[PDB]
Amino acid sequence: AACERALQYKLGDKIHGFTVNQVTSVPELFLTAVKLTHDDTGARYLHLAREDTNNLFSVQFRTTPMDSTGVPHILQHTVLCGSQKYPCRDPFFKMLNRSLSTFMNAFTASDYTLYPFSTQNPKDFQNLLSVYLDATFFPCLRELDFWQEGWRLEHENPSDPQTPLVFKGVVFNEMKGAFTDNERIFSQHLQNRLLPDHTYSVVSGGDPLCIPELTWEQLKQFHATHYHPSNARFFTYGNFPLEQHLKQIHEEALSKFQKIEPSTVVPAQTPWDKPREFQITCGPDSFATDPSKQTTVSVSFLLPDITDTFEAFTLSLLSSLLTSGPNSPFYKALIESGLGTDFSPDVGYNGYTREAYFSVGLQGIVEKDIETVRSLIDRTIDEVVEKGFEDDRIEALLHKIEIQMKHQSTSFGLMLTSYIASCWNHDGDPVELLKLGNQLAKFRQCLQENPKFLQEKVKQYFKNNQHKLTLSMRPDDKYHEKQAQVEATKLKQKVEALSPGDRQQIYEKGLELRSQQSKPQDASCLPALKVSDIEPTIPVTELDVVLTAGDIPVQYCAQPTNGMVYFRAFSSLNTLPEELRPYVPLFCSVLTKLGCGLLDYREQAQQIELKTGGMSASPHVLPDDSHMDTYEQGVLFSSLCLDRNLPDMMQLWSEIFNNPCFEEEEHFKVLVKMTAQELANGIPDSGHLYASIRAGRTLTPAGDLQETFSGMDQVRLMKRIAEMTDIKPILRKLPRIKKHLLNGDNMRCSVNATPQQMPQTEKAVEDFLRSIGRSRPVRPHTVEKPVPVIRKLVMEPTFKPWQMKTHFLMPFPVNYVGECIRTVPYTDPDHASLKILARLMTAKFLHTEIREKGGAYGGGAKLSHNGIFTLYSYRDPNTIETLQSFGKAVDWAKSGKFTQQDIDEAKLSVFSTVDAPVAPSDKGMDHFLYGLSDEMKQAHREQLFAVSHDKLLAVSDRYLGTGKSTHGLAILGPENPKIAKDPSWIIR
Ligand SMILES: Cc1cc(C(=O)N2CCN(C(c3ccccc3)c3ccccc3)CC2)ccc1[N+](=O)[O-]
Ligand SMILES: Cc1cc(C(=O)N2CCN(C(c3ccccc3)c3ccccc3)CC2)ccc1[N+](=O)[O-]
Ligand SMILES: [Zn+2]
């Protein structure tokens, strides 16, 4: 094993310019931590040796912006645009298609920037390490790359100098879109006001109104000050040998540098002598909600340095006990009181900054209740200090942590490096964050030695703490219009200030940029894997289907789950009256939360938290593999637990199926409003998903149901329900739904657990199935399709697809665009071609047109299992032009002007996605949900391998050409005059 070999490292070992400083076994995480420092530069290194073939690298820099230009964010984009060893244009995006990576990306936190990738191929790992090391340490930082990624002045027509100058840039629009999320606005201001004395007071990602203040020289200087290895933390994880990583890192990068003392320290925030208050504004919601019904207020407290790890562990658990779930004191005082709709953003513990902070409050407050909310926060703090916490809640909490520690995920390295970053950033010891057994033991010991331990902590940090911030936010109906006018003004000033020489240089550089964006260039300097590096076959999944409780099929899959059990049940929707369909998602979200039998909603929540890692239900439409107009509909019941709590888990499922408390009217109203609030808040962030779902709604029977379940129709339905004065007519629908769903008449189940736990599990499941009820479909055409377990699917053989174009009028500064095209299902031989084509179009055409030229944050094409080919954009400054580029993309595809190497790279990209690691808990789910056998997946795999140039041009013409297939279109974004005057567009 890797972690055992790492145990052979000794203190003082010299390896490729590094010295081993510490070797620590962490058996609760099955890993050995190795701490090293690079001798000449002093750069810190952490290697986590573990038997995991999905290896990860990251490099981290302490980046401390002193303004809101977004320079660290823009620099992060720009270093990926070309480097000394890989000077060609855009090494990073190109490597995405020359790799079998499981993850490739970068991001910018408030005061650090992190560059991680992961892969299961050791040669791929070396390739990516070289590209990453060169980008970060020796970037070209070309002026025009900065103009593309950051901001620039550009003529509306770059080759016409008589057209007006406008602002453009990828990050420019990226941040406009980020702050389309009003929770993100609140969150940004909270941090800026609470920590006003240094870097944390600015908008690290870039305030859109300040971004055009960034100059090329400021960008280069910021790299010089922060991208030195003495200011870096290097991280690797997995079973690939450490020696090779260290060799590259020293020889490629670190050997070129000497040690410095980086001018990058973040000083401590000096604590306030008295509390502060501030008021801010945000955008209106999408539903023209009255601003006096939409107030957010929160109260935040400054906490100690996160580098004091045990105190940080204490405060984190404390914050959870205060705010998590319907038994927490703040939930009870604030949420169940009906004072708001949900917690305010960043509720709980925030430890990404040098000093952590706790925050609590509400959104959805009527302005008149604001002073009551503030009062209740204070009163709740006083009560907790006096009474402390329930013992069984503390046990539930430690159980919750145990489940996190034991659960096996497929991206453990990515999770770990993100997790330790802020602590490491301020010279903390990341290894102490891995020693969870120690932290827990000391926490338990503190509780035992001092019965008022947590009460004392609450008094010290929440009652006596003068560094307290009250922040309130109210929507402004012209928030973004006001932003745009300020920008229009700023733009005008910039432009009128230009000399004739400036205007000429802006014109020439713009044409030079467009040229660089257009002219095909050689990428041979870049490393690459080959298609022959892709595995020919996949490891078979061993499962065992057992008919149980009579005729109910249960799928058993033995896996290394580390003492965890994962249970799923799938119950058909085929007998439910179709009028109840829209209410199934609501039914699903409250089913495990209203109480069951003798446990009221509070008792049930406590049991669920003490005995499980979660219990949920969700509605699903599962498209058939061979027929576009056939699907399966049902509800998925899902849960997980430790081995020893399996019986308790199934006891909960039994009571939930048999006696859910649908008379719980008051907690029901609370959940409805929480859900509606959260759905509305999530629209911008998933803007393109909402567009795609609307656009596909008229293309297949399933698409129509999917919009009902999770489209804008569903968000709107929840919003209406949440505003009703009498929710009784809705609540009375829940029993009608239970009648058709909560029984074993049309059910199948799955179990994932260790082989030695399987026997106990079969018993517990069979008992559950015998405890729920037993003894014709609403749709006239249903088909039985056996699995290579017989699924009963709906088919609508008279379904005819039709075209629709919908514009959702949204108070957004950017757009979200979707165009869906009906093409064949998964088992159709043309499907593999279309899948390759999607990635090809994305890489070769759409990314450049929509993002690089347009300045949209994202633009591409994808193909779903259902056979819907989707073209989309995300945070897009343009709507009509994007729709035009969708069309030109299909013309390009039809033209066949892509090479064999382009096709090979599209294959690499696609296989890097479909061969991504599956967790032990999820093995066999392709079979369970979609009825996809290994023989089907392998046939699909061979079709993907066989995809050729002539096949690609053929399917481009056959399905994507004009008039060949049915299209659907949708946009979320502000008013567009051209669209408003086109009668083929429905405005919503
Ligand atoms: C700094 C930070 C990091 C994380 C984080 O990455 N995770 C993921 C890992 N997870 C670890 C953990 C869970 C419970 C108790 C202690 C630590 C974790 C989970 C599983 C394995 C190893 C660590 C904590 C949350 C979340 C929030 C914050 N923060 O707000 O300050
Ligand atoms: C209670 C809880 C918390 C967290 C969590 O977010 N963190 C993030 C912060 N993290 C702190 C920490 C972990 C290990 C050792 C010491 C502290 C922490 C990590 C980095 C900076 C500041 C605090 C604790 C867990 C995740 C899950 C659970 N849970 O299981 O209910
Ligand atoms: Zn970005």
PDB file of N, CA, C and O in Angstrom, residues 2 5 9 47 55 122 125 236 238-246:
ATOM      1  N   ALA A   2       0.296   2.355  -0.472  1.00  0.00           N
ATOM      2  CA  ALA A   2       1.031   3.602  -0.580  1.00  0.00           C
ATOM      3  C   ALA A   2       1.315   4.166   0.794  1.00  0.00           C
ATOM      4  O   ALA A   2       2.411   4.644   1.052  1.00  0.00           O
ATOM      5  N   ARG A   5       4.247   2.449   2.454  1.00  0.00           N
ATOM      6  CA  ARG A   5       5.557   2.806   1.926  1.00  0.00           C
ATOM      7  C   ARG A   5       5.994   4.180   2.418  1.00  0.00           C
ATOM      8  O   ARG A   5       7.172   4.405   2.679  1.00  0.00           O
ATOM      9  N   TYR A   9       9.591   6.687   5.055  1.00  0.00           N
ATOM     10  CA  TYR A   9      10.322   7.947   5.017  1.00  0.00           C
ATOM     11  C   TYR A   9      10.790   8.297   6.415  1.00  0.00           C
ATOM     12  O   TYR A   9      10.088   8.048   7.391  1.00  0.00           O
ATOM     13  N   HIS A  47       2.380  15.782   1.175  1.00  0.00           N
ATOM     14  CA  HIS A  47       1.977  14.611   0.426  1.00  0.00           C
ATOM     15  C   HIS A  47       1.129  13.707   1.299  1.00  0.00           C
ATOM     16  O   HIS A  47       1.515  13.362   2.416  1.00  0.00           O
ATOM     17  N   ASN A  55      -5.229  10.280  -8.381  1.00  0.00           N
ATOM     18  CA  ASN A  55      -4.231  11.179  -7.807  1.00  0.00           C
ATOM     19  C   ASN A  55      -4.484  12.654  -8.102  1.00  0.00           C
ATOM     20  O   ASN A  55      -4.930  13.013  -9.184  1.00  0.00           O
ATOM     21  N   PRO A 122      -0.820   7.826 -14.668  1.00  0.00           N
ATOM     22  CA  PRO A 122       0.431   8.376 -14.130  1.00  0.00           C
ATOM     23  C   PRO A 122       1.231   9.198 -15.147  1.00  0.00           C
ATOM     24  O   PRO A 122       1.941  10.126 -14.763  1.00  0.00           O
ATOM     25  N   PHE A 125      -0.576  12.462 -15.422  1.00  0.00           N
ATOM     26  CA  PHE A 125      -0.261  13.242 -14.237  1.00  0.00           C
ATOM     27  C   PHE A 125       1.011  14.067 -14.447  1.00  0.00           C
ATOM     28  O   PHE A 125       1.043  15.253 -14.123  1.00  0.00           O
ATOM     29  N   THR A 236       0.132  16.965  -2.962  1.00  0.00           N
ATOM     30  CA  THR A 236      -0.199  15.795  -3.776  1.00  0.00           C
ATOM     31  C   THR A 236      -0.906  14.733  -2.941  1.00  0.00           C
ATOM     32  O   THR A 236      -0.786  14.690  -1.719  1.00  0.00           O
ATOM     33  N   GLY A 238      -2.536  10.485  -3.230  1.00  0.00           N
ATOM     34  CA  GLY A 238      -2.789   9.247  -3.950  1.00  0.00           C
ATOM     35  C   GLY A 238      -1.651   8.243  -3.924  1.00  0.00           C
ATOM     36  O   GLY A 238      -0.743   8.353  -3.113  1.00  0.00           O
ATOM     37  N   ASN A 239      -1.693   7.266  -4.827  1.00  0.00           N
ATOM     38  CA  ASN A 239      -0.739   6.169  -4.787  1.00  0.00           C
ATOM     39  C   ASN A 239       0.429   6.292  -5.762  1.00  0.00           C
ATOM     40  O   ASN A 239       1.337   5.474  -5.728  1.00  0.00           O
ATOM     41  N   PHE A 240       0.425   7.304  -6.621  1.00  0.00           N
ATOM     42  CA  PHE A 240       1.589   7.553  -7.463  1.00  0.00           C
ATOM     43  C   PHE A 240       2.749   7.977  -6.577  1.00  0.00           C
ATOM     44  O   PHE A 240       2.575   8.782  -5.673  1.00  0.00           O
ATOM     45  N   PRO A 241       3.941   7.433  -6.836  1.00  0.00           N
ATOM     46  CA  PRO A 241       5.142   7.718  -6.045  1.00  0.00           C
ATOM     47  C   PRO A 241       5.504   9.208  -5.948  1.00  0.00           C
ATOM     48  O   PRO A 241       5.532   9.943  -6.940  1.00  0.00           O
ATOM     49  N   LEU A 242       5.793   9.628  -4.722  1.00  0.00           N
ATOM     50  CA  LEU A 242       6.120  11.010  -4.410  1.00  0.00           C
ATOM     51  C   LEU A 242       7.405  11.496  -5.071  1.00  0.00           C
ATOM     52  O   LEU A 242       7.494  12.659  -5.446  1.00  0.00           O
ATOM     53  N   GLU A 243       8.394  10.609  -5.203  1.00  0.00           N
ATOM     54  CA  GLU A 243       9.710  10.985  -5.721  1.00  0.00           C
ATOM     55  C   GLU A 243       9.619  11.655  -7.079  1.00  0.00           C
ATOM     56  O   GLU A 243      10.296  12.647  -7.329  1.00  0.00           O
ATOM     57  N   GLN A 244       8.795  11.095  -7.953  1.00  0.00           N
ATOM     58  CA  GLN A 244       8.597  11.655  -9.280  1.00  0.00           C
ATOM     59  C   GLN A 244       7.994  13.069  -9.263  1.00  0.00           C
ATOM     60  O   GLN A 244       8.373  13.907 -10.078  1.00  0.00           O
ATOM     61  N   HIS A 245       7.052  13.327  -8.359  1.00  0.00           N
ATOM     62  CA  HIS A 245       6.448  14.659  -8.249  1.00  0.00           C
ATOM     63  C   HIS A 245       7.501  15.669  -7.844  1.00  0.00           C
ATOM     64  O   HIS A 245       7.630  16.727  -8.455  1.00  0.00           O
ATOM     65  N   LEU A 246       8.238  15.338  -6.788  1.00  0.00           N
ATOM     66  CA  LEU A 246       9.255  16.227  -6.262  1.00  0.00           C
ATOM     67  C   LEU A 246      10.329  16.523  -7.296  1.00  0.00           C
ATOM     68  O   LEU A 246      10.827  17.646  -7.367  1.00  0.00           O
TER      69      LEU A 246
END
